[PDB]
Structures are given as C-alpha cells and as structure tokens.
Design an enzyme around this catalytic site. Structure first.
Site, PDB file in Angstrom:
ATOM      1  N   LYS A  39      50.146  77.463  30.512  1.00 29.69           N
ATOM      2  CA  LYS A  39      49.065  78.284  31.068  1.00 29.69           C
ATOM      3  C   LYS A  39      49.602  79.118  32.218  1.00 29.69           C
ATOM      4  O   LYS A  39      50.037  78.569  33.218  1.00 29.69           O
ATOM      5  CB  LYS A  39      47.929  77.395  31.553  1.00 29.69           C
ATOM      6  CG  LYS A  39      46.980  78.090  32.495  1.00 29.69           C
ATOM      7  CD  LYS A  39      45.632  77.393  32.551  1.00 29.69           C
ATOM      8  CE  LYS A  39      45.758  75.932  32.908  1.00 29.69           C
ATOM      9  NZ  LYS A  39      44.428  75.285  32.782  1.00 29.69           N
ATOM     10  N   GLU A  88      49.795  69.351  28.061  1.00 27.56           N
ATOM     11  CA  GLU A  88      49.794  68.688  26.770  1.00 27.56           C
ATOM     12  C   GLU A  88      49.068  69.713  25.902  1.00 27.56           C
ATOM     13  O   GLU A  88      48.153  70.379  26.374  1.00 27.56           O
ATOM     14  CB  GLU A  88      48.965  67.398  26.862  1.00 27.56           C
ATOM     15  CG  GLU A  88      49.058  66.479  25.671  1.00 27.56           C
ATOM     16  CD  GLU A  88      47.968  65.412  25.647  1.00 27.56           C
ATOM     17  OE1 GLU A  88      47.638  64.837  26.726  1.00 27.56           O
ATOM     18  OE2 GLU A  88      47.456  65.145  24.532  1.00 27.56           O
ATOM     19  N   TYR A  89      49.470  69.864  24.652  1.00 23.90           N
ATOM     20  CA  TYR A  89      48.808  70.811  23.760  1.00 23.90           C
ATOM     21  C   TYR A  89      47.778  70.037  22.900  1.00 23.90           C
ATOM     22  O   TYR A  89      48.113  68.998  22.332  1.00 23.90           O
ATOM     23  CB  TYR A  89      49.888  71.489  22.911  1.00 23.90           C
ATOM     24  CG  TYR A  89      49.426  72.078  21.603  1.00 23.90           C
ATOM     25  CD1 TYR A  89      48.725  73.286  21.562  1.00 23.90           C
ATOM     26  CD2 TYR A  89      49.672  71.419  20.399  1.00 23.90           C
ATOM     27  CE1 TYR A  89      48.280  73.819  20.353  1.00 23.90           C
ATOM     28  CE2 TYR A  89      49.228  71.944  19.196  1.00 23.90           C
ATOM     29  CZ  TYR A  89      48.534  73.138  19.182  1.00 23.90           C
ATOM     30  OH  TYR A  89      48.079  73.643  17.987  1.00 23.90           O
ATOM     31  N   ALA A  90      46.529  70.513  22.840  1.00 17.68           N
ATOM     32  CA  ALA A  90      45.461  69.868  22.045  1.00 17.68           C
ATOM     33  C   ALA A  90      45.251  70.668  20.764  1.00 17.68           C
ATOM     34  O   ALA A  90      44.613  71.707  20.791  1.00 17.68           O
ATOM     35  CB  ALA A  90      44.177  69.838  22.837  1.00 17.68           C
ATOM     36  N   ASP A 133      33.078  68.745  36.678  1.00 26.05           N
ATOM     37  CA  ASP A 133      33.164  69.975  35.889  1.00 26.05           C
ATOM     38  C   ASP A 133      33.336  69.688  34.406  1.00 26.05           C
ATOM     39  O   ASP A 133      34.195  70.252  33.727  1.00 26.05           O
ATOM     40  CB  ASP A 133      34.317  70.841  36.423  1.00 26.05           C
ATOM     41  CG  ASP A 133      34.365  72.226  35.795  1.00 26.05           C
ATOM     42  OD1 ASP A 133      33.300  72.754  35.400  1.00 26.05           O
ATOM     43  OD2 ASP A 133      35.481  72.791  35.722  1.00 26.05           O
ATOM     44  N   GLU A 137      33.611  73.035  27.404  1.00 26.88           N
ATOM     45  CA  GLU A 137      34.719  73.984  27.278  1.00 26.88           C
ATOM     46  C   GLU A 137      35.924  73.482  28.071  1.00 26.88           C
ATOM     47  O   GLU A 137      36.986  74.119  28.123  1.00 26.88           O
ATOM     48  CB  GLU A 137      34.293  75.376  27.750  1.00 26.88           C
ATOM     49  CG  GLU A 137      33.747  75.384  29.144  1.00 26.88           C
ATOM     50  CD  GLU A 137      32.582  76.330  29.292  1.00 26.88           C
ATOM     51  OE1 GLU A 137      31.710  76.334  28.382  1.00 26.88           O
ATOM     52  OE2 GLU A 137      32.537  77.053  30.321  1.00 26.88           O
ATOM     53  N   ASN A 138      35.739  72.325  28.692  1.00 26.98           N
ATOM     54  CA  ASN A 138      36.804  71.687  29.442  1.00 26.98           C
ATOM     55  C   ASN A 138      37.065  70.383  28.739  1.00 26.98           C
ATOM     56  O   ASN A 138      37.543  69.425  29.326  1.00 26.98           O
ATOM     57  CB  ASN A 138      36.408  71.434  30.895  1.00 26.98           C
ATOM     58  CG  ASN A 138      36.585  72.663  31.753  1.00 26.98           C
ATOM     59  OD1 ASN A 138      37.261  73.615  31.347  1.00 26.98           O
ATOM     60  ND2 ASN A 138      35.994  72.654  32.943  1.00 26.98           N
ATOM     61  N   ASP A 151      41.216  70.521  32.774  1.00 31.86           N
ATOM     62  CA  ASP A 151      40.833  71.335  33.924  1.00 31.86           C
ATOM     63  C   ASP A 151      40.285  70.566  35.118  1.00 31.86           C
ATOM     64  O   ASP A 151      39.123  70.728  35.495  1.00 31.86           O
ATOM     65  CB  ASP A 151      39.825  72.410  33.485  1.00 31.86           C
ATOM     66  CG  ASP A 151      40.285  73.185  32.231  1.00 31.86           C
ATOM     67  OD1 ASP A 151      39.613  74.169  31.840  1.00 31.86           O
ATOM     68  OD2 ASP A 151      41.317  72.814  31.623  1.00 31.86           O
TER      69      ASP A 151
HETATM   70  O1  LIG Z   1      41.073  77.511  19.171  1.00 36.13           O
HETATM   71  C1  LIG Z   1      42.227  77.551  19.489  1.00 36.13           C
HETATM   72  O2  LIG Z   1      43.018  78.505  18.979  1.00 36.13           O
HETATM   73  C2  LIG Z   1      42.718  76.619  20.349  1.00 36.13           C
HETATM   74  C3  LIG Z   1      42.064  76.365  21.589  1.00 36.13           C
HETATM   75  C4  LIG Z   1      42.586  75.373  22.473  1.00 36.13           C
HETATM   76  C5  LIG Z   1      43.771  74.628  22.129  1.00 36.13           C
HETATM   77  N1  LIG Z   1      44.263  73.694  22.901  1.00 36.13           N
HETATM   78  C6  LIG Z   1      44.642  73.792  24.135  1.00 36.13           C
HETATM   79  N2  LIG Z   1      45.698  73.017  24.483  1.00 36.13           N
HETATM   80  C7  LIG Z   1      46.111  73.096  25.781  1.00 36.13           C
HETATM   81  C8  LIG Z   1      45.523  73.908  26.744  1.00 36.13           C
HETATM   82  C9  LIG Z   1      44.441  74.672  26.303  1.00 36.13           C
HETATM   83  N3  LIG Z   1      43.869  75.450  27.198  1.00 36.13           N
HETATM   84  C10 LIG Z   1      42.927  76.350  26.986  1.00 36.13           C
HETATM   85  C11 LIG Z   1      42.981  77.249  25.857  1.00 36.13           C
HETATM   86  C12 LIG Z   1      41.962  78.214  25.642  1.00 36.13           C
HETATM   87  C13 LIG Z   1      40.867  78.312  26.543  1.00 36.13           C
HETATM   88  C14 LIG Z   1      40.783  77.445  27.669  1.00 36.13           C
HETATM   89  C15 LIG Z   1      41.800  76.455  27.912  1.00 36.13           C
HETATM   90  C16 LIG Z   1      41.681  75.629  29.024  1.00 36.13           C
HETATM   91  O3  LIG Z   1      42.454  75.750  29.965  1.00 36.13           O
HETATM   92  O4  LIG Z   1      40.698  74.697  29.077  1.00 36.13           O
HETATM   93  N4  LIG Z   1      43.980  74.628  24.996  1.00 36.13           N
HETATM   94  C17 LIG Z   1      44.413  74.896  20.891  1.00 36.13           C
HETATM   95  C18 LIG Z   1      43.893  75.883  20.007  1.00 36.13           C
END
Ligand SMILES: O=C(O)c1ccc(Nc2nccc(Nc3ccccc3C(=O)O)n2)cc1
EC number: 2.7.11.1
Length: 264
Positions: A39, A88-90, A133, A137-138, A151
């Site tokens: 990020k 970490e990637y979700a 929070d 969306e978090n 977040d």
């Molecule tokens: O749908 C998609 O393509 C999509 C959306 C989210 C993820 N995952 C993910 N992982 C790690 C960090 C992160 N941050 C954010 C991404 C987008 C918007 C906000 C955040 C955040 O910081 O909460 N989002 C993967 C794919």
C-alpha cells in the site's frame, strides 16, 4: 524484523484498490517469490492531514498483533516521496464488495463472520487495543474466505479520549464516540452490532441521508427490523446496540449466543 526494503525488492502487480492517501497494489517479493499487498502513500498527501502520529500507530500495532483474523502487517519503508506498507494479501477482496455482490448475507455467513470477528476482537481487547473502525470495508477475506480485520489506523489504547476529528461517516460509531465522550473496548461491541444488522439487512441500522440525521438516529439509538430478520438475530443485535456502554455484552456472550450457533 531487521529487514529494511526498497521499492526494488518488489514487482508491483495489479492495482487492488483505494484512492485515499494512495493505492494498494498486488506485489511480488523478488527474492522469495512471496505474494503480498503493497500500500503506497504519497507522504505529502499525509502530512497535510497530520496522520504522522496515527499512521505510525497503524504500522506499529498491526505489526505486533498476530491472529488469523487480523491482517498481518510485515514491515514498511519510505520512498524519496512516499511510504509503502508490506501487508498480508487477502485473496477474496473486502467484505464490502461481498455485500454489494449478494445484497444481504444468510444467517450462517453472518453468524460466521460475526464469530471470527468477535474472536479477532477478543484478542486485540485482551491487549486493551480497541479498533473503533469496523466497517465492512475494513474487513478482508483470506484464501479460505475467513474474515480478516484490517486498517488499524484509528486503533488506539483504551480506555481513551477522542480528540479525533472523525472525518468520514458515523454509521459505525457509538453514542460516546460521536458525542465526543470518553470510551473503551465497548465501542467495538456496538460496531459488531451494526455489522450484524448490516450483514443481514444490507444497510446499517442507522443509515441516513445526512451526517446530521444519522447523528440523531445514533445517539437516540433509533433503528427498526425488516420482517425477515429472525428473532435470535434481533435479540443479539438489540443486546449489542444498547446506548450505555456497560450494558452491551462481552465477547463470550457473543460467541455463546444461541443464535450465534447458526454458523461455523
Ligand atoms: O477486489 C479486489 O480486486 C481485491 C480487493 C482487496 C484485496 N485484498 C487486499 N489485500 C491486502 C490489502 C488490501 N487493501 C485494500 C485494497 C483495496 C481497497 C482498500 C484496501 C484497504 O486498505 O482496506 N486488499 C484483494 C483483491
């Protein structure tokens, strides 16, 4: 730790999202091939909002907390003009998209998210950490679909005092944080209440057209249940969404609630 990185250790991938202080990108750790989220924050876009001593909290807290429902934060590093966070990637996106995607959730999906959420919170709370929070969306989704809290920017030690300018929407804050009073771990239990209502109805219980009419609705705790929400849910939600912080349940009662046993 003991690892200081540089933008050159990662091959940035596709843009995951956002647009606030910066964006979130999919990224690849060159050496190990490891996949994660990077990020980026423009530095300048931050200072002119004085988050310095709050983004500092996001990074430090989320770094030491380790739990399967908390998004792990690995480290960080600043550019010549930026600041990147190695997260970490979700894999399954935010819970916020899952909603605009199904409109409402069933009682098993809601009960399960609420569970993972309560466990995850019970942990931070075991350490006087209060989030304050909890927006859908978090809330992310791990590779197996488990809820993951992210977040912790607005996170804070508790009990505590909120100077905080509290920019965005109020949909998720309890009477105490909005009427700018002091507060404790209980703020995260009102939020859990709202999420539950939102996960089942599709919108939050206090949603309004203006910041000002939501403010009223919240402080006066004015919310109603559409006909489909079952009793067991109304109960739990009504238990969580009580005005007096001390009357809201603990997490055990939430993890033990009868209706909560309509999950996984
Ligand atoms: O749908 C998609 O393509 C999509 C959306 C989210 C993820 N995952 C993910 N992982 C790690 C960090 C992160 N941050 C954010 C991404 C987008 C918007 C906000 C955040 C955040 O910081 O909460 N989002 C993967 C794919």
């Amino acid at each position: 730790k003991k690892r200081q990185w540089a933008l050159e250790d990662f091959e940035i991938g596709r843009p995951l999202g956002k647009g606030k202080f910066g964006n979130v990108y999919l990224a690849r750790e060159k050496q190990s091939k490891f996949i994660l989220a990077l990020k980026v924050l423009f530095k300048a876009q931050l200072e002119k909002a004085g988050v310095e001593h709050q983004l500092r909290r996001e990074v430090e807290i989320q770094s030491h907390l380790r739990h399967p429902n908390i998004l792990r934060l690995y480290g960080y590093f600043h550019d010549a003009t930026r600041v990147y966070l190695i997260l970490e990637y979700a894999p399954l996106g935010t819970v916020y998209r899952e909603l605009q995607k199904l409109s409402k959730f069933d009682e098993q999906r809601t009960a399960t998210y609420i569970t993972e959420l309560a466990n995850a919170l019970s942990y931070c709370h075991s350490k006087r950490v209060i989030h304050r929070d909890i927006k859908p969306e978090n809330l992310l989704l791990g590779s197996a679909g488990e809820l993951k809290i992210a977040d912790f920017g607005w996170s804070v030690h508790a009990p505590s005092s909120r100077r905080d300018t509290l920019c965005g929407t109020l949909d998720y804050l309890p009477p105490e944080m909005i009427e700018g009073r002091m507060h404790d771990e209980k703020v995260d239990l009102w939020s859990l209440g709202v999420l539950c209502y939102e996960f089942l109805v599709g919108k939050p219980p206090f949603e309004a057209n203006t910041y000002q009419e939501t403010y009223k609705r919240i402080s006066r705790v004015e919310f109603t249940f559409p006909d489909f929400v079952t009793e067991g849910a109304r109960d739990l939600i009504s238990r969580l969404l009580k005005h007096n912080p001390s009357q809201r349940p603990m997490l055990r009662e939430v993890l033990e609630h009868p209706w909560i046993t309509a999950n996984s």
